[PDB]
Amino acid sequence: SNNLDSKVGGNYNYLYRLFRKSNLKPFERDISTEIYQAGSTPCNGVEGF
Amino acid sequence: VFNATRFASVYAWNRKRISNCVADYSVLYNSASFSTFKCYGVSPTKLND
Secondary structure (H helix, E strand, C coil): CHHHHCCCCCCCCCCCCCCCCCCCCCCCCCCCCCCCCCCCCCCCCCCCC | CCCCCCCCCHHHCCCCCCCCCCCCCCCCCCCCCCCCCCCCCCCHHHHHC
C-alpha cells in the first residue's frame, strides 16, 4: 500500500509492539503502554534506565 | 575486552579474537555499567544457553 499510506517525510501513524513481558496467546490483542523493564531494577513512572 | 585502561580510537578500531572459552554474561548483562546493551538476533537472557 506504498501509494496509499506512506509519506515522503515518514508516516509515523503505524505502531508495532517491540517489547512485552511474555509470549502473546493466539488471536489475543494487547492495548498496554506500560514501560517494559529490560534491566533487573523495577522501573516506575513514564521513563527509565 | 571491557575493563581496559584505554580503548582504541574509532578510526583505528581494534579486533580481538576470542576462542576456547566460556561466555558467561552474569557480571555483564545484570550490571548497571552498560548504558546500552543490545543483541539484534538473540535475546540477551539466552546468551548462557
